[PDB]
Amino acid sequence: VIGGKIVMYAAPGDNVQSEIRNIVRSKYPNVEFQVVSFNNADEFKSRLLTELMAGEGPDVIVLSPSTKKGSITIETMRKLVESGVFCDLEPYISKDESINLSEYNETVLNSGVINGKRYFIPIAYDVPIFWTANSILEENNIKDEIANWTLKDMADFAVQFKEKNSDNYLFGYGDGFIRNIMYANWREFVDYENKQASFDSQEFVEFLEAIGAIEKAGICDEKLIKEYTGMEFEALKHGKITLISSTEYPINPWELWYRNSHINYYFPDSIRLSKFPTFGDLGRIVAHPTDIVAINKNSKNKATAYEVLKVFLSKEIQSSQQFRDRMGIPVNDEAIRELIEKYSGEEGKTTLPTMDTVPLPESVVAEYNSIINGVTECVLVDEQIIDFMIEGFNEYKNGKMSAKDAARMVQQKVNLFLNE
């Protein structure tokens, strides 16, 4: 029997849950939604997390725990999941004929499988990438080399760039750029299964030295990009930045068409994208979820809560306008398939505030597909681990410690974080 009360909380900027309720109420008209809306971000995070760890809270939990634009960043989301505040979703997925995991990005969905239990469903994710205009790549003679760049190839371009351009930044923008380097390379130094890290290693020292040369070429602040009327595209046109990597906007099909159209406005040009230059001998391309849904372990109306949870995965929700504005890259494969088709055809030839847009070029779609289809794993990482890596890099960058002392400090804090 699908019905009864379902309690769920709404974060300040939430516009998707109202969609879910109408669809959920279209079927099962007996579901009684009790919505608690929040206007303060700190009151939402404080009340939700404290209630879950005290055995209370809403029946269905919608969270944005990473660092994208409208997120409520949670420091130890993975440890919170490991404490068991959410129930295992496998008994519901197994019993349900109507759901089939082949329709979704299974590599991303596996981020919700921790310690052998499907604790949550990631409805959207992000892949750290850097992008720019193609004509800017040809002006720097790296049009055909950034796709095969290593992190040391990028640092060596940054030193050569810093010696060439001494009044412009090489990268933008904000703190999201350096976090993107950590998002792409933390797996190289952290073994969650065995609860140990290898930050006190020659690889991480060279990793810090590589980031140090990259940052010396300049990363403009987020407060310098908002000053431009054309945002990062205008600053790219004026030469203030050359390569862009940011955490604010995951590259959903709309963002790709939006960036390509804006770049074509300032330059006949197209967007060029690439996965982040990574370290190591292995071929890891690591994504992380930005939006998750789960059921409270102490909910007395499960199965009804599971029915509400599934609507977040539907092609209709995942391809909606509200989902595009507030969530990351959708995990429903048909939604991505439908969205790319829309911006690759006549609907991609419209107007954007005003400028004339162009449909996505075949070249851009193939480069986009090579990245999302190239994701090798998707892991929910504790944001605190990423913060430890950054505060270790800042000690070396700010001349407070040597590279080997900063690698040893990160190894300490992370190893004792993994072991409680």
Numbering used by the authors: 33 to 299, 301 to 386, 394 to 460
Sentences from the paper on this structure:
Clostridium thermocellum has extensive potential in lignocellulose biorefineries as an environmentally prominent, thermophilic, cellulolytic bacterium. Previously, five putative sugar transporters, denoted A to D and L and belonging to the ABC transport systems group, were identified in the genome of C. thermocellum, and the solute-binding lipoproteins (SBP) of these ABC transporters were shown to bind different dextrins by isothermal titration calorimetry (ITC) assays. To gain insight into the structural mechanism of the transporter specificities, 11 crystal structures, both alone and in complex with appropriate saccharides, were solved for all 5 putative sugar-binding proteins, thus providing detailed specific interactions between the proteins and the corresponding saccharides. Combined genetic, biophysical, and structural studies have provided solid evidence that transporter A and transporter B are the major glucose and cellodextrin transporters, respectively, among the five potential sugar transporters in C. thermocellum.
However, the expected substrate-binding pocket between domain I and domain II in CbpC was blocked by an additional loop that was absent in the other proteins, suggesting that CbpC might not be a functional sugar-binding protein. For CbpC and CbpD, no interaction was detected for all of the tested carbohydrate substrates in both ITC and NMR experiments, suggesting that transporters C and D are not responsible for glucose or cellodextrin transport.
